[PDB]
Short mmCIF file of C-alpha atoms in Angstrom, two decimals:
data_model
loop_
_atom_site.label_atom_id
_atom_site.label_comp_id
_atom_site.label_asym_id
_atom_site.label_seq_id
_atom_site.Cartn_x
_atom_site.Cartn_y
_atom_site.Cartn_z
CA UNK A 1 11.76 -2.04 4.16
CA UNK A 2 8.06 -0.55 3.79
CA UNK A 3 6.69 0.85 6.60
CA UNK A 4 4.20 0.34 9.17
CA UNK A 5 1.24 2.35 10.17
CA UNK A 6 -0.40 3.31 13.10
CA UNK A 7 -3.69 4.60 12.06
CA UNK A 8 -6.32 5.33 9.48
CA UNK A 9 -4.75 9.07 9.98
CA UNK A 10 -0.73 7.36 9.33
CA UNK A 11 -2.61 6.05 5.91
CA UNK A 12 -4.55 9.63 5.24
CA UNK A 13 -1.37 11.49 6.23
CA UNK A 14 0.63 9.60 3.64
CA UNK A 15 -1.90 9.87 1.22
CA UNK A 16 -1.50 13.74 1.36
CA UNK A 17 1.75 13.38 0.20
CA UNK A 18 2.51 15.03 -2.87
CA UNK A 19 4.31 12.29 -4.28
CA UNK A 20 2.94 8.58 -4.87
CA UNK A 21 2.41 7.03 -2.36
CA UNK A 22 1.18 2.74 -2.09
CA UNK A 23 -0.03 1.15 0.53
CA UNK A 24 0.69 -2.15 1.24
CA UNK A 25 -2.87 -2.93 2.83
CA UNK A 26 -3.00 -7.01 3.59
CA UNK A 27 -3.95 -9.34 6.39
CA UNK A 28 -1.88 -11.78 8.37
CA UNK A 29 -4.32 -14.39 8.63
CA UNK A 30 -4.92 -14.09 4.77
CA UNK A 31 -3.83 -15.98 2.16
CA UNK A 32 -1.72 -14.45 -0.51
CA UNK A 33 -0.72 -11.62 2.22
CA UNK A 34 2.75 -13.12 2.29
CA UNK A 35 2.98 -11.61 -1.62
CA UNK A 36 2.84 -8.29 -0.74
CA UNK A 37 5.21 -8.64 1.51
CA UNK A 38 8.07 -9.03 -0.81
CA UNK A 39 6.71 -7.74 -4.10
CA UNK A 40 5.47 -4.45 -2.82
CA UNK A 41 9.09 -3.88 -1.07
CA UNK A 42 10.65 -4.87 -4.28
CA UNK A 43 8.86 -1.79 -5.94
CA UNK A 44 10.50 0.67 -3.98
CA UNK A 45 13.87 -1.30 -3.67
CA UNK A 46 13.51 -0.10 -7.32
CA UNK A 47 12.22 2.97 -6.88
CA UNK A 48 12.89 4.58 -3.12
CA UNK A 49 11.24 7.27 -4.78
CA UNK A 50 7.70 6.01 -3.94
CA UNK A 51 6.20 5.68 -0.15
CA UNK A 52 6.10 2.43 0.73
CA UNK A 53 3.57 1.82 3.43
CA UNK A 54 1.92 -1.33 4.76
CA UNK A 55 -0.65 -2.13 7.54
CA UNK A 56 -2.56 -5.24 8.12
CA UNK A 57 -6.51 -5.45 7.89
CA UNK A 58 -6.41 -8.08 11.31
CA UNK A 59 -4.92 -5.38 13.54
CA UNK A 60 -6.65 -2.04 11.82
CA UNK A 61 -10.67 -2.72 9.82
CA UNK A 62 -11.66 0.47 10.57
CA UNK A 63 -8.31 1.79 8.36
CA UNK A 64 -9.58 -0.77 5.83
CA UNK A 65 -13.09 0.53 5.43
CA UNK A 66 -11.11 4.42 5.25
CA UNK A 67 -9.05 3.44 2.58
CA UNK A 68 -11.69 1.23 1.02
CA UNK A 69 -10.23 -1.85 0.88
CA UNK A 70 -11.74 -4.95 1.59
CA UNK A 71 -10.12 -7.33 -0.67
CA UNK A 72 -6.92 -9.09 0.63
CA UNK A 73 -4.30 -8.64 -0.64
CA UNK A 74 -4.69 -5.03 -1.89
CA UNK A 75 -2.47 -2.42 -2.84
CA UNK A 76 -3.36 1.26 -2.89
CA UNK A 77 -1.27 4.07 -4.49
CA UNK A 78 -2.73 7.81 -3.85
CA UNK A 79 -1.47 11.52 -4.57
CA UNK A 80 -2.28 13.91 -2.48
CA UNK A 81 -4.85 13.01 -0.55
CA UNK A 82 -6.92 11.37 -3.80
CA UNK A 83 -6.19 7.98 -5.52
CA UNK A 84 -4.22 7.43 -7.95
CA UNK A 85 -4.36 2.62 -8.43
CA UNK A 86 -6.43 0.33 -6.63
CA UNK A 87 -4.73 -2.95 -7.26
CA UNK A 88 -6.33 -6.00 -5.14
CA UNK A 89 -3.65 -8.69 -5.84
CA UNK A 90 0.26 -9.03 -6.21
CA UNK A 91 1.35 -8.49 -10.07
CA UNK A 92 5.03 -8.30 -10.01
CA UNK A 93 5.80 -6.40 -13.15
CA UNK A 94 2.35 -4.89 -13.93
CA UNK A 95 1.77 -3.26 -10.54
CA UNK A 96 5.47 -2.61 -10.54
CA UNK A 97 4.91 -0.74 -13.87
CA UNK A 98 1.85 0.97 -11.93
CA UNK A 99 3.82 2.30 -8.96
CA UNK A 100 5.99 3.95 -11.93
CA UNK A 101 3.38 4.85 -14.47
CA UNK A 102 1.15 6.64 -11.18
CA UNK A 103 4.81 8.17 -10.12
#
């Protein structure tokens, strides 16, 4: 399971995690949301290791615009409290591989 967030400040406060940390960050009237969905909790049903967070764009923009995502679907991985991948689209094995290689 990855979990929800609240707020742009439940994204910034598990940015400032000092361990990696992605961010499921979608839409549910988009597209290709649905892949993010499964792929992104298949990376940490890997790796538990890694913060698995997701929020959707329809119910927060404002978060969006924080995290600076605009794209749909887009996955963003951080250490504390700066970046550390900007994906904007499900890759199975490559973005797993990210999640790791950021890790």
């Amino acid at each position: 399971m990855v979990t929800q967030f609240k707020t742009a400040s439940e994204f910034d406060s598990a940015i400032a995690q000092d361990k990696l940390v992605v961010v499921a960050f979608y839409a549910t009237w988009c597209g290709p949301c649905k892949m993010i969905a499964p792929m992104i909790e298949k990376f940490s049903e890997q790796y538990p290791q890694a913060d698995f967070y997701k929020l959707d764009v329809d119910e927060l923009g404002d978060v969006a615009q924080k995290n600076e995502v605009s794209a749909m679907p887009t996955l963003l991985l951080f250490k504390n409290g700066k970046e550390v991948a900007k994906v904007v689209g499900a890759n199975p094995a490559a973005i797993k591989q990210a999640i790791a290689a950021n890790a």
